[PDB]
Design a protein around this ligand. Structure first.
Ligand SMILES: CCCCCCCC/C=C\CCCCCCCC(=O)OC[C@H](COP(=O)(O)OCC[N+](C)(C)C)OC(=O)CCCCCCC/C=C\CCCCCCCC
Ligand SMILES: CCCCCCCC/C=C\CCCCCCCC(=O)OC[C@H](COP(=O)(O)OCC[N+](C)(C)C)OC(=O)CCCCCCC/C=C\CCCCCCCC
Ligand SMILES: CCCCCCCC/C=C\CCCCCCCC(=O)OC[C@H](COP(=O)(O)OCC[N+](C)(C)C)OC(=O)CCCCCCC/C=C\CCCCCCCC
Ligand SMILES: CCCCCCCC/C=C\CCCCCCCC(=O)OC[C@H](COP(=O)(O)OCC[N+](C)(C)C)OC(=O)CCCCCCC/C=C\CCCCCCCC
Ligand SMILES: CCCCCCCC/C=C\CCCCCCCC(=O)OC[C@H](COP(=O)(O)OCC[N+](C)(C)C)OC(=O)CCCCCCC/C=C\CCCCCCCC
Ligand SMILES: CCCCCCCC/C=C\CCCCCCCC(=O)OC[C@H](COP(=O)(O)OCC[N+](C)(C)C)OC(=O)CCCCCCC/C=C\CCCCCCCC
Ligand SMILES: CCCCCCCC/C=C\CCCCCCCC(=O)OC[C@H](COP(=O)(O)OCC[N+](C)(C)C)OC(=O)CCCCCCC/C=C\CCCCCCCC
Ligand SMILES: CCCCCCCC/C=C\CCCCCCCC(=O)OC[C@H](COP(=O)(O)OCC[N+](C)(C)C)OC(=O)CCCCCCC/C=C\CCCCCCCC
Ligand SMILES: CCCCCCCC/C=C\CCCCCCCC(=O)OC[C@H](COP(=O)(O)OCC[N+](C)(C)C)OC(=O)CCCCCCC/C=C\CCCCCCCC
Ligand SMILES: CCCCCCCC/C=C\CCCCCCCC(=O)OC[C@H](COP(=O)(O)OCC[N+](C)(C)C)OC(=O)CCCCCCC/C=C\CCCCCCCC
Ligand SMILES: CC(C)CCC[C@@H](C)[C@@H]1CC[C@H]2[C@@H]3CC=C4C[C@@H](O)CC[C@]4(C)[C@@H]3CC[C@@]21C
Ligand SMILES: O=c1[nH]c2cc(C(F)(F)F)c(N3CCOCC3)cc2n(CP(=O)(O)O)c1=O
Ligand SMILES: O=c1[nH]c2cc(C(F)(F)F)c(N3CCOCC3)cc2n(CP(=O)(O)O)c1=O
Lengths: 179, 140, 395, 135, 49, 126, 49
């Protein structure tokens, strides 16, 4: 239940079909049986009920009582129930979010273009300042970037399969020339 | 999970928010009519007639194919209202159609005022309703 | 005589003795005679029947009849442990567990549909494409007529988005920031969606993955397409008749009424009707011959699901013998040592036929849907052009 | 008509007779006959338009029946071949068996006759536009 | 369920209670094995597993 | 209600198939359906050419040659063979090794016979 | 001058979109090859579970 598809417990069939039909519905049974065994009602060695119990079990097999009592305990009193080969709307789903988010962006731009151009019907100073500010900020940001060492983080560790949690062995905040 | 029903509530929220703008123009046009203009108010409404009555016609085909029989039903009283409003009251036009040839009457103008506040009240009802069933279907 | 059990060897004419006969119950009888200790003598029953009580004469009818009276001493054969047989002969513990199983035809590819090209995307997507198509064309309309920079009518906004979806741009393009956002995210849509169509179709044609239509008896029970069928006089048909359980009642009322007759007269004919059906007939058989006919040429059949009941085959002796207790302890010895299992891999799975890709070209049947939509779309446009000619010129 | 294996020269008219199916081509069967019917109409209408050139509409309408006859030949030949390919599909896989279908010289003629109606249906439209600008 | 040990040769459990007189019958998942069939009598299998 | 002759209608449809949009496009809803369903045609056909060619070149790349006896042990589409006398048969016969058990299992029960009588005949069969 | 900027930007997007289509086709093929465990023989080969 915890290993996420890494462990396959080889057990008895009827304990496997029990635990499958048992809350939480987390495990299942694949394939068929590996050997063939059998359960038997068992008498001492020379009992009186050696033959009538033998004829009882065969009579219950043919009437279907042993299957009626099988569907009751393993399956009826069991807290469970009982692939499409195609891309669904969960695979290509952010595409419909970028599309709808692009149409919603466009109509609020059509509101802004309408208000800006209706009041336009009713320069060098800007481009001088916007060129200089975006330059000296761009001079500032790359200047900080080249000198400061936080370009790349690098964590190497080991796996601990209990919880599949990890433990570090190494961690970096490396830079352009500074580990 | 994102399903075809959930996409239909997204796209109708995108479009009914353009339908509320068609009726906020519908209130501001007739309000400036009475305070003050025929051919100006004649034109600007009629080009926003058949866009309005057909985007809502897109909705009625959208929720049909999404098998959302509730939200299909809540737009039915407006659809046959729209169906009567184009077929009957055409008065003449002889162009695209609606709303204006020589209006100037407290009967017709208050009937346009009966529209103006009702269409805004119905569509703003729908925008929060379409937001409701969108968020409902996505997290369920 | 029934395979993979005793069967006459290929040179049965020249040989004589215990060497004319080969099979599972010859190798089994050799192992029973080793652990018990005797010299066996293989004697095929004269009747050729397993054993049943005759109606009112009360004389038995085969291998059960030979053990009761005097004609044999042991029956190492596929003889089912039932109630009416245990009352006269003594069985061992089962050397083989089995039950009623389901035989189908091996699942083939298909017949490719007339809309089989739509398969790489789910029908939830192909509808989302159509309504996002109109929903973009509506937004491209509104934003081009209101808030203009015109040319994008709803006639032309549907055409720009069609060319954008069908990877073939048009002789119109939006000229406003507002209209170019609508164009730009609809272009990103159709890049991803059509790369996802080609990629999933490349996943299809590479990895060929067949599925079984039915995989149990309950999944047989809730369908109407595939027919059932058993033999007309056996323990299989009598099982479904006197059952009461939940599903085999429903699987009887179907088979009792529904015609042409699902019942057959021979196992060999019932296998034929599986192959003479292309996947509508499911012969309900006993588990061991189903695994037999699966592993024989021509390989066309398949066992699905698990067994429907549980019964067993057992070595029988007369009622009171010095063989009865040593043979019973021999079967449980051969079961735990894996002799009964290594003889199972031998005769069913090793001493037999079939084992455990090509990418043919796409046939016209795979893409025949778009040839029908094309000519149907050409016939539709000749209708519209006649309607246009009447409406324009006469008025 | 069986040809080499048990050379049964009895030609089985498939409607009532009796291995292959070969009533798979009954779905395809109407469409060459529908197209031959549309083409034979067009040959009537294009000839009488040449006999009487005081009408022009006889030329263009005969242009439609040629082009409709071609589109009935495509759906003919598509549904013919699509009915073939999914019957060589329903053959149980084997290494001692081979099927080899091969189209013949009457399949080529229905293929060639597609090109001739689409030619004549185009040419009956240019004949109309020259005749309609004449009158 | 039941097992003889090599030391004392005494069964422990439901096989032990049938052989050594404590019980009459053992309706349970008692698996039909070889080493048990020599000391007790199993019926036909009521469950194949 | 042209620019579309048959020479320009045959040219619009090359460029619609060969996905290279032409100078002219239909301006009537009659013609914009013929333009529309021809575009959906070529969208499916070219995606089916690209993805069937990708299914060819993947599967021929999966084809791994025989490089062991274990690779022969699984792949029973290439038949084995052993000279029908001598120590090469007697190796696979009395073997108790897992791969060589399965190899003798095939070779003893197969038709037509994998067991050749002579080396020069066995090379001839290869 | 401008038809080189137009030219090398076209060759860029020719490679990038062909690398998106064909890596997505390599995703969906390999996840389709993933066959679940259906026997002990399928466990016998696959020693990652
Ligand atoms: C046609 C029709 O149907 O009416 C179109 C009208 C008016 O539009 P127009 O300006 O483009 O007309 C012509 C273009 N001119 C006036 C710019 C030259 O109405 C419109 O806006 C229709 C706008 C779209 C509304 C939803 C469409 C989807 C409906 C059903 C699909 C399911
Ligand atoms: C079944 C019949 C249904 C349609 C019956 C025909 C009514 C439309 C009509 O008779 O008139 C056609 C108008 C043309 O108008 P146009 O201004 O574009 O002139 C175009 C310029 N010339 C001069 C080159 C042609 O087409 C339009 O407007 C239609 C505007 C939008 C409709 C798009 C719907 C497309 C999907 C399916 C159609 C089926
Ligand atoms: C007119 C426009 C047409 C084209 C529109 C495409 C959008 C281009 C975006 C421009 C700037 C948008 C700023 C986005 C800010 C997001 C902030 C953020 O940090 O949130 C990342 C989000 C959520 O993703 P995630 O965390 O679930 O990833 C999985 C991570 N895991 C596995 C660890 C769980 O990612 C996202 O939304 C990614 C959204 C964008 C990703 C690239 C889209 C296409 C790129 C270029 C297209 C055009 C190229 C030139 C022509
Ligand atoms: C503006 C649009 C311009 C052009 C649109 C093209 C119009 C389509 C022309 C006829 C195409 C057609 O209709 O394809 C014939 C089908 C085939 O027959 P089938 O479905 O029995 O094949 C059984 C296969 N299986 C079970 C997988 C369904 O006939 C059928 O019944 C089709 C069943 C669904 C009916 C919708 C057909 C297309 C939509 C038309 C509106
Ligand atoms: C969705 C998939 C469907 C696929 C389609 C099915 C195809 C197969 C079925 C039937 C084969 C089609 C047979 C028709 C052959 C062409 C008909 C035709 O072309 O007729 C002839 C005339 C054209 O000559 P004109 O007008 O230039 O002469 C006027 C003279 N001048 C110019 C001096 C004024 O046309 C006229 O009379 C026009 C007057 C009548 C039109 C009334 C409105 C149309 C309404 C319904 C039509 C339905 C047709 C059946 C389908
Ligand atoms: C140009 C095309 C044909 C020109 C006409 C040549 C003279 C008329 C006879 C004819 O037409 O026979 C052409 C062959 C038929 O050979 P066979 O089957 O009778 O050989 C059987 C071997 N023997 C004959 C020894 C039994 O052609 C074939 O192979 C037919 C099968 C090959 C492909 C299907 C035909 C349609 C494909 C393209 C044509 C489309 C329009 C043409 C532009
Ligand atoms: C088979 C291919 C067609 C066979 C013959 C091709 C040329 C026919 C021909 O020689 O007639 C030439 C005609 C008119 O003669 P002109 O030189 O005086 O033209 C100048 C017009 N003026 C005088 C107004 C300036 O030009 C034309 O437009 C005739 C129309 C073109 C011929 C039909 C093309 C059919 C294409 C595809 C359908 C079937 C595919 C196979
Ligand atoms: C598998 C894929 C293979 C692809 C094969 C493509 C086949 C292409 C065909 C090749 C055969 C020769 C083509 C003939 C060359 C014609 C050149 C020509 O002379 O063009 C000038 C004429 C003069 O008229 P205009 O346009 O200047 O004035 C009217 C325009 N206005 C109204 C705007 C003033 O234009 C006209 O007559 C209108 C055109 C009439 C003649 C064109 C004949 C088309 C021939 C088709 C052969 C069948 C093969 C089909 C496949
Ligand atoms: C871009 C626009 C929409 C995307 C095109 C592809 C999405 C449509 C797919 C679809 O779901 O539908 C395909 C229909 C045929 O129907 P079906 O396969 O769904 O049958 C039901 C099938 N079953 C029975 C198995 C459930 O094939 C079709 O017609 C769709 C292909 C036709 C291409 C566009 C129509 C041409 C004319 C457009 C005029 C508007 C522009 C000018 C004004
Ligand atoms: C279409 C035109 C030609 C096809 C483009 C693709 C074929 C070129 C491929 C090629 O073999 O070369 C690619 C070159 C880089 O060289 P390399 O990889 O071969 O180095 C040698 C590599 N080793 C060392 C491993 C051998 O990348 C390139 O530049 C080719 C891509 C540039 C796209 C066309 C150039 C842009 C401007 C064109 C102006 C002309 C039109 C206006 C007048
Ligand atoms: C293509 C995508 C990224 C959309 C980008 C538009 C974004 C960045 C935003 C949304 C609101 C916008 C505005 C919307 C429209 C106005 C009026 C127009 O005359 C110039 C652009 C201008 C002044 C803005 C520019 C940019 C803007 C701030
Ligand atoms: O004791 C019995 N053992 C049986 C064993 C087999 C076999 F599986 F072949 F071993 C079969 N067949 C089933 C398939 O078709 C061929 C014969 C029938 C048996 N029957 C008759 P049924 O069970 O009444 O049908 C018995 O009575
Ligand atoms: O001692 C032996 N030395 C052998 C030496 C050779 C050779 F390599 F040619 F020298 C061969 N051949 C290989 C193939 O068949 C033709 C001859 C067989 C030999 N054999 C018979 P084996 O039983 O098949 O091994 C021996 O017994």
């Amino acid at each position: 239940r915890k290993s996420k598809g890494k462990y396959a417990y080889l057990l008895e069939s009827t304990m496997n079909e029990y635990i499958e039909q048992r809350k939480p519905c987390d495990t299942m049974k694949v394939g068929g049986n590996l050997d063939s065994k059998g359960y038997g009602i068992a008498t001492p060695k020379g009992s009186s009920l050696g033959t009538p119990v033998n004829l009882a079990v065969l009579k219950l097999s043919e009437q279907g009582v042993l299957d009626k009592l099988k569907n009751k305990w393993w399956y009826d009193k069991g807290e469970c129930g009982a692939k499409t080969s195609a891309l669904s709307l969960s695979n290509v789903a952010g595409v419909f979010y970028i599309l709808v988010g692009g149409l919603g962006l466009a109509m609020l731009v059509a509101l802004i273009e309408f208000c800006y151009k209706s009041r336009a019907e009713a320069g060098r100073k800007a481009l001088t300042l916007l060129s200089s500010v975006f330059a000296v900020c761009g001079l500032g940001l790359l200047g900080i970037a080249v000198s400061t060492d936080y370009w790349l983080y690098l964590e190497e560790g080991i796996i601990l399969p209990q919880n599949q949690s990890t433990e570090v062995k190494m961690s970096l905040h490396s830079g352009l020339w500074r580990v | 999970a994102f399903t075809f029903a959930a996409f239909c509530y997204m796209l109708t929220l995108v479009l009914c928010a353009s339908l509320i703008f068609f009726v906020i123009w519908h209130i501001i046009a007739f309000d400036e009519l009475r305070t003050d203009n025929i051919e100006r108010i004649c034109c600007l409404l009629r080009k926003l007639v058949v866009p309005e009555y057909s985007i809502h016609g897109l909705f009625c085909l959208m929720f049909l194919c999404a098998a959302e029989w509730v939200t299909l039903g809540l737009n039915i009283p407006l659809l046959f209202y729209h169906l009567w409003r184009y077929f009957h009251r055409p008065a003449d036009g002889s162009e695209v159609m609606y709303d204006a040839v020589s209006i100037m009457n407290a009967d017709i103008l208050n009937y346009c005022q009966k529209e103006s506040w009702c269409k805004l009240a119905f569509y703003l009802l729908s925008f929060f309703y379409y937001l409701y069933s969108m968020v409902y279907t996505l997290v369920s | 005589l029934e395979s993979p059990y005793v069967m006459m060897k290929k040179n049965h004419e020249m040989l004589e003795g215990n060497e004319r006969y080969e099979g599972y119950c010859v190798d089994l009888a050799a192992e029973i005679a080793k652990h018990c200790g005797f010299k066996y003598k293989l004697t095929i029953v004269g009747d050729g029947k397993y054993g049943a009580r005759d109606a009112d004469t009360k004389i038995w009818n085969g291998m059960v009849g030979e053990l009761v009276y005097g004609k044999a001493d042991i029956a190492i054969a596929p003889l089912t442990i039932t109630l009416v047989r245990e009352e006269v002969i003594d069985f061992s513990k089962p050397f083989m567990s089995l039950g009623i199983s389901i035989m189908i035809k091996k699942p083939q590819k298909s017949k490719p549909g007339v809309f089989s090209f739509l398969d790489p995307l789910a029908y939830e997507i192909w509808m989302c494409i159509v309504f996002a198509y109109i929903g973009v064309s509506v937004v491209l309309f509104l934003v081009s007529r209101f808030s203009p920079y015109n040319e994008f009518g709803i006639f032309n906004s549907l055409w720009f988005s069609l060319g954008a979806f069908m990877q073939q741009g048009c002789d119109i393009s939006p000229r406003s920031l507002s209209g170019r956002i609508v164009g730009g995210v609809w272009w990103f849509f159709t890049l991803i969606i059509i790369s996802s169509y080609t990629a999933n179709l490349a996943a299809f044609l590479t990895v060929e993955r067949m599925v079984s239509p039915i995989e149990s008896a309950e999944d047989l029970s809730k369908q109407t397409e595939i027919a059932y069928g058993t033999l007309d006089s056996g323990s299989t048909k009598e099982f479904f008749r006197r059952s009461k359980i939940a599903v085999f009642d429903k699987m009887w009322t179907y088979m009792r009424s529904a015609e042409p007759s699902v019942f057959v007269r021979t196992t060999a004919e019932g296998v034929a009707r599986v192959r003479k059906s292309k996947g509508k007939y499911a012969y309900l058989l006993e588990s061991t011959m189903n695994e037999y006919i699966e592993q024989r040429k021509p390989c066309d059949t398949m066992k699905v699901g698990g067994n429907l009941d549980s019964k067993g085959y057992g070595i029988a002796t007369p009622k009171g013998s010095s063989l009865g207790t040593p043979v019973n302890l021999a079967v449980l010895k051969l079961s735990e040592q894996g002799v009964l299992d290594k003889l199972k891999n031998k005769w069913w799975y090793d001493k037999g036929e079939c084992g455990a890709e090509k990418t043919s070209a796409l046939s016209l049947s795979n893409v025949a849907g778009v040839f029908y939509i094309l000519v149907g779309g050409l016939g539709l446009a000749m209708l519209v052009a006649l309607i246009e000619f009447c409406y324009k010129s006469r008025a | 008509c069986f040809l080499a294996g048990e050379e049964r020269g009895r030609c089985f008219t498939i409607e009532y007779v009796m291995v292959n199916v070969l009533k798979m081509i009954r779905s395809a069967t109407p469409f060459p006959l529908v197209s031959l019917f549309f083409m034979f109409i067009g040959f009537i209408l294009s000839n009488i338009g040449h006999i009487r050139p005081h009408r022009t509409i006889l030329a263009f309408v005969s242009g439609i029946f040629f082009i409709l006859s071609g589109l009935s030949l495509v759906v003919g030949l598509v549904l013919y071949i699509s009915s073939i390919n999914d019957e060589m599909l329903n053959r149980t896989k084997d290494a001692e068996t081979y099927f080899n279908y091969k189209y013949g010289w009457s399949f080529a003629f229905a293929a060639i006759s597609f090109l001739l109606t689409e030619s004549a249906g185009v040419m009956s439209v240019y004949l109309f536009m020259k005749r309609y600008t004449a009158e």
